[PDB]
Amino acid sequence: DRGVSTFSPEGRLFQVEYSLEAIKLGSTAIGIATKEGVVLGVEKRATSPLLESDSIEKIVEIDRHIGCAMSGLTADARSMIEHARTAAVTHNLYYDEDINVESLTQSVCDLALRFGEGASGEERLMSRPFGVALLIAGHDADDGYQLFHAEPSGTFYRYNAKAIGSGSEGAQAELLNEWHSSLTLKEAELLVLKILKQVMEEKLDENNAQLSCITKQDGFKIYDNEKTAELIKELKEKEAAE
Amino acid sequence: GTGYDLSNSVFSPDGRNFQVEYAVKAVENGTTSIGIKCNDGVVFAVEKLITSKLLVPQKNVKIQVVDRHIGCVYSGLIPDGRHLVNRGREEAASFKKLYKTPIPIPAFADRLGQYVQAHTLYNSVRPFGVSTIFGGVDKNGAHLYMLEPSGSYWGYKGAATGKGRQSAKAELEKLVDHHPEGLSAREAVKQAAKIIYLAHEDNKEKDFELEISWCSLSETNGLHKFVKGDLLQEAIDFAQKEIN
Amino acid sequence: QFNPYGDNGGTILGIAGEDFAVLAGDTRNITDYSINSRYEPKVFDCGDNIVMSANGFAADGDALVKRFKNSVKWYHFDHNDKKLSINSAARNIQHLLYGKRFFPYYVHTII
């Protein structure tokens, strides 16, 4: 056949580029970073009405000051979350302090290129790259509120706002215009909820969409369905206003 | 059918290994390098293509020393040559550690020979993309060797490989005929400079830098040393005079 | 039978002020009843405004200080030149020392 860590004539890794195609078929995930906190929102996308929606866990806690949302082959994420949670707690054990959001992200991305059939470097025993992209949102005392996009390429970008999944290119163009440096946390909540409603195939309600935030004070919290339901009601009223 | 040239260790119906013969093309593509065996030592010289004025003169050294008595120069893929000398150095250290005496040149030759030959036994490795000219002084006289990607090597009076190997070999053949009593170390350095300048005409588009080294029993106490300053200029001038 | 440990003597003293701190130590290095050196520094600037001294077996002391100095260098590389807080250094040294719990560094260390 052809090697799993083979270069294309255009100087790209085939398996990484095919991995990015899998992520485009995934459920939409949106992150917005403000000076009041970072908001993470995801499309649940239940395949059947019999599927108990609240069992869909696409936003997960890494530590009290770091959360992350996933998009693509969500099963692949489990071992990435496990490494991230271990890296964060392990760092706290060694240095009696919270891990830097950037350093946590860099640790998760170190896994990404550990694939091959015996590549001459170390011992990368993993048959393929990850089929999932992560939006890692957190706070630290050094660089404040941060949002990171972690790809299976092993590169990570810091975004003021970022959308990944099926409706990404559409949502990203919307975030381009709507984001300013002086957004409030509430403004960012409605904005994620608005852009999700736009790209979601289903009508957005408190069952097929989930919000979460990370603030310096209360840390990373997943919004319960009652709290999200009122923010949806608040959105519709402000859209119908003009 | 075909496909006999897609895997390293595969024999073609005519009993050839095409992957080895393709490695030879990488060598032929490379810079020209020579070796001259004089009456009590050996002289190594190589062409250094100056890509631009940005290359720091006299800095990007190509000729490598093994132990303190062996010189190695190669043509083709420079990294592959470095990998072979790295092995050669480990190989020479291993020998000296057990037997005390510094490795004889024939002994060292077979050590490189067996290692290069090993990279033609399996499809999981690529053959070496370099022909290496090496040698020095040991217990019983001076020795000059040339090692092909196949693992094939012989002893030589003179050796040449790379871009302008024909020009070189032709000039070497003239020296062997016109000096049956043997060339001197001093003379062999001047003569090496000329042959590089003459063999450069197969690459005359790009300006080049000359690099010579030698291992003489009388002139360097049987240690590998680089030709520098006055003796280098004297050799460059001898070549620049006889190119016209 | 070979004894891996020795005693190079010396004494170290740390006092904390309201807005300052001192780490002092004698410069004498000894073996049994012989003086090795009258001036062999024992207290070291490790960077990030941390001073360290591992007194007891000089070899194990130098080894520990050397590994911690190296630990500070790699903290900078791995966490965007962030300053290693004194509390973070303390916890890091606990792991350096407990790493050799069953072949210990024969030193009493103060930072």
Next chain:
Amino acid sequence: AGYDRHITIFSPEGRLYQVEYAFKATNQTNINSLAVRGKDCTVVISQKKVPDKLLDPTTVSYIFCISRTIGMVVNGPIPDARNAALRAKAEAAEFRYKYGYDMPCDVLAKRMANLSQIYTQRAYMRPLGVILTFVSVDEELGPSIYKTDPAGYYVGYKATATGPKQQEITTNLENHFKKSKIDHINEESWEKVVEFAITHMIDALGTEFSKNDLEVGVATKDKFFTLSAENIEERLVAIAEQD
């Protein structure tokens, strides 16, 4: 389906093409070698061809001193020849150390043949494109010639020949042994056995040899040695004073 010619697996005809192509590599050097047994010696003659004037003729050899007693001449490329040589030397040294007596010619032959057989069955190892002719005066069997090939085949010979014009040298020696009715060269001195080997080499190939065109190895009781250019010249002068 068509990869049964790339690795050492069976073709539908029950054939190993990589073994057959390895045999083809043995003639790449275009060198002919023969071995004959004397009354108490074994002689190997090989053609010595030095095309390049820049080559050091003294270093060009396809005859190897494996042990004090065993000599080996190779037909094939020198890298594979030297691979086989170093292995035989290592196996001869190890045997002596473990079993407390010099490895016999036929046992080294069997051992080297068994190694070749493994490359014939395991995919990741290619066969060596060489034919190894081992010679000695064994302390049990006397004058001995044993030859191995890339297939892992080996057998003892009264005399043998290897290379492109193998068949011509073979039939020449055959016809001599049909006539003499004996299985060796009836001669006391090895010098005359070398002269015989060179004489029948000339007769079969139909080529005259100078001192630098040949390469000779002699095995006697408790030593194997190669002849110098001047030892061969003395041999070439002797055969000249008969024709």
Next chain:
Amino acid sequence: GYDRALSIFSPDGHIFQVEYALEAVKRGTCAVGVKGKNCVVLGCERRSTLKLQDTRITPSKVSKIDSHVVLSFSGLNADSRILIEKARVEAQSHRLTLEDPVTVEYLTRYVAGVQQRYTQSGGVRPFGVSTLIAGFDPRDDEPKLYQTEPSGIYSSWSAQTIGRNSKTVREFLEKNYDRKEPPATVEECVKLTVRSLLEVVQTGAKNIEITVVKPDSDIVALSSEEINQYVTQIEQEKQEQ
């Protein structure tokens, strides 16, 4: 030794080996699970390619992982055993360290993790198996029902089916299962399960096996007669119209 990457991405961002593993599940015999107010029921159809089997010894479709949790499956029977064994071992390992039986969610999350690991490990193919894991968390009366698939994805269902003609029996459950009023009795919970299988099984008294799980490790498998009674009563519901 063997570490050849069998599960890899294709140009369109698909892992064909995981995709073809789901096709092995589609081939497998239908399995269904509905959860009532105070119980979960697992129904599975039996094949009829060869009929001369000893039903005493032939491995049954619903396996006990612990005394309080059960696992049914659709796909390769051989593959299912390796997952069931690993689950049963983990169930005991959890009890030994945490001093508490596994939650149904935890046991599922483990089995899901195993299936996932075989999708990006060298020299292995994914499991040709989807599972329905059902039971009650320790000292809990809230019924639990989870599904896993070869990809390693898992989630909980009010009711779900997997295997051959799962498309049909899911359609039935979607327009027969009210989340407002789940089957309040054990009886009417089993009735809805058999009804859903009868859509696919095509007159199968001996071709339908049912397992009822109630709180506090109360698991029982219904006999042919007990199920045959439900089949008799359901066929009268149709004929009385």
Next chain:
Amino acid sequence: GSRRYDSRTTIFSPEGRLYQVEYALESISHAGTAIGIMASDGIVLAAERKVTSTLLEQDTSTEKLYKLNDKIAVAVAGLTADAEILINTARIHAQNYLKTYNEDIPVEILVRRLSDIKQGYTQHGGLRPFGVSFIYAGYDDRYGYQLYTSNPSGNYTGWKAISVGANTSAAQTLLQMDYKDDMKVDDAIELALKTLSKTTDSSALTYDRLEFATIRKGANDGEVYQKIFKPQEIKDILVKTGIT
């Protein structure tokens, strides 16, 4: 590299089938037919020897009926060499269980273990599966007389009567026709021979082409007895049943 020559024995087809398992079953479909029949008072194993000669020593011959335990035997269909590898491991597992618990292994536990080994070659290792189908005839004090079957897929099932190897479709129809639950061993011996006699690809069903075994609990004992029939004993039962 080596990737070029990898068959990939453990992959799914687009339809979700295991190529090697399917082709291994095709191999077994050509092997000599083997039948198991479970009665109220014992079990019968009958197998047809594929290919025979006048010069084939039948007295010292065993190619289909092997003894795993004092209470468990197997009928083989496929590669004899492959079967002997699995039989040897199955014999060991039975002895490991006895050493551990001081009780003879229950039939299903042995069958599941062998079936789990076959499943291994199906999911990992990149090796060909075992071209073998087994009929397990055994007795334990839990389920009494048991008859199992296993195939290269590593899937196993229990039966009242079953056939493996050649013409299973025809053989299974004839068994399903004449089998009753209240059957005796002597009735099962007859049924087994009648079925083989009508599915045979040869002229007549003679003694020299048959292997026969029964697992009975001889009433005048109270313990289970395995009887692998001798050539003369097969010749006798062949005349009594009315096949001469």
Next chain:
Amino acid sequence: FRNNYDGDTVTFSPTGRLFQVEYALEAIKQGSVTVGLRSNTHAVLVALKRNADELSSYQKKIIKCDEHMGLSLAGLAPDARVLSNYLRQQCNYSSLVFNRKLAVERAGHLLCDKAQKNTQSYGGRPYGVGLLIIGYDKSGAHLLEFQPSGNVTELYGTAIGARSQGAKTYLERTLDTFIKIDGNPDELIKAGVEAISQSLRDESLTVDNLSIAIVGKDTPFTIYDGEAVAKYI
């Protein structure tokens, strides 16, 4: 032709080429431009940082390896992280064992040999990144160019990445000028900014876009980003 001999790095082409290596070299040309140049006293790295969106950050291009050595990347960032991390260890090993700052020339030799091993073994892939290493050792200021092929070259100045030929021609012309900028860091940086700006086309180098590093006689390897590079735009 090419399609049959580019499956892996272990395969030579009939012309004697390694296509997997050449494909890795292609990943560099697609990478954002970075420039290196040295006098006798100082060595400067000037790198153009690239952004994904206007909402994203400009990915860092310069990594510190020791107090006296550092490098700029062009191509795959993870491969730059692996090689830079290896070079950090070799600099670190030299310090701890020999109490010796690792010579820039020897740092080059080690990167060369590490890259080479990925080009001769099956299963492995070449590194998909080019590196410009600067350092002040015992033999003055140094600039190295690293290529995934394993080829390392000591130069007065150079540039790698997209439109890198623009800067390389400028430096080849300015050679006699900038080589003599001794004991003036600000003038050597300005000469490096005038070099990289010769490879612009899309935009003009802004504050959070430009990345500069310097090492020299009495200057430890320090990276300037943002506000700190405002006086060079």
Next chain:
Amino acid sequence: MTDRYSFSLTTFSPSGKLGQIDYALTAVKQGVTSLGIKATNGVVIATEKKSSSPLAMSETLSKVSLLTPDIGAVYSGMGPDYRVLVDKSRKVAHTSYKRIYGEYPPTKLLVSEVAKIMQEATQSGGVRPFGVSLLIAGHDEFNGFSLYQVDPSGSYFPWKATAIGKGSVAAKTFLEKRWNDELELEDAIHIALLTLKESVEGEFNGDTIELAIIGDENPDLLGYTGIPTDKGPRFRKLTSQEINDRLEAL
């Protein structure tokens, strides 16, 4: 480096054939004819010494090999494959039996051990099957005389008489006519020499024929006296002279 061939080179084809085993059996068919006949009081195994050159010494190549003092082996197909199988067979007789039970293995079990080695070459990673069929003749106290055939598949069967290689089809037919359950060892050697004459094209004498028997104990071949229980090896290779003596009564 490293054997990266960790996968099977023998795989089931859609028809259910194992290609490499079938192709191995084809290689066996091309091989020189070898046969075995079992008598009441012994077994005989015979083959033709196909000399690859008249300069070659046919004596220095044993196609018939002693495995144990009571077990002998002969083959048809690839000589090198046979040579390494004999080496492994001799060693496994010691490691897996004699070093445990303090006696040589019975014929059927040593055959079973050779069968296993050849089965592993059929399934193990990065290997081809052995291109030989073996005929193993042996004696043991509790089974008496026995003769076994072993094929590349690893399958083995006991024979009263059989042949393998070139003219096996014709040779098997001639043995079916001449064999009875009352043959003496001398009668079996006579039948063996008759059967092998039909296979041989050129010279048919003691120097071109290799023949060995598993018969009575040879106390003269033991090499020591004084242990009554040790009566000597049952395996004996007939000399060039001993064959020619029986060829005059052909």
Next chain:
Amino acid sequence: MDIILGIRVQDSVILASSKAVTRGISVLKDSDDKTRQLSPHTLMSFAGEAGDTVQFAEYIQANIQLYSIREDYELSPQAVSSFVRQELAKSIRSRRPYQVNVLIGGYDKKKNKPELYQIDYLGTKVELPYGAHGYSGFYTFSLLDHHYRPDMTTEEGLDLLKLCVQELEKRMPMDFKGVIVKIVDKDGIRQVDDFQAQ
């Protein structure tokens, strides 16, 4: 050390195990249950080294409970004891052996007969009408040699234990803080909560 007694009567096995756990010159607990239920009709009491004692018991319990679920069947008391003996017989030649002595009391539902197995840390198994581990045996075996009958009821069996405990409370140096008594019969395992004064 700790007191581990077992007694097999007509239709049951009775296990009596001391409630005291002591480190140094302190009795840390006076209500310790030195037994684990391996299966509904098999009980194992244990005594020995501080850590090894419970770690080994829970390890055996885990393995038997795993087997029970896999086979949906209860292993015979004989089968369980044979498994335990082999684990100890492995342990004794390992880097650090389990220093644990066990009694296994089980009702074989197949044979309809109670069974008591005594196994020491070496892996020395034996089936007995009555058993003891450590120093208890030195006084209890001669008592039971005298007063034991095989046809005794469970009630007679408890009276015979009460007599053994009274003797150990009179002549043994250490305060073992009474015993927890458990009956293993056809109906499974129950605890005699009223042995403080029966």
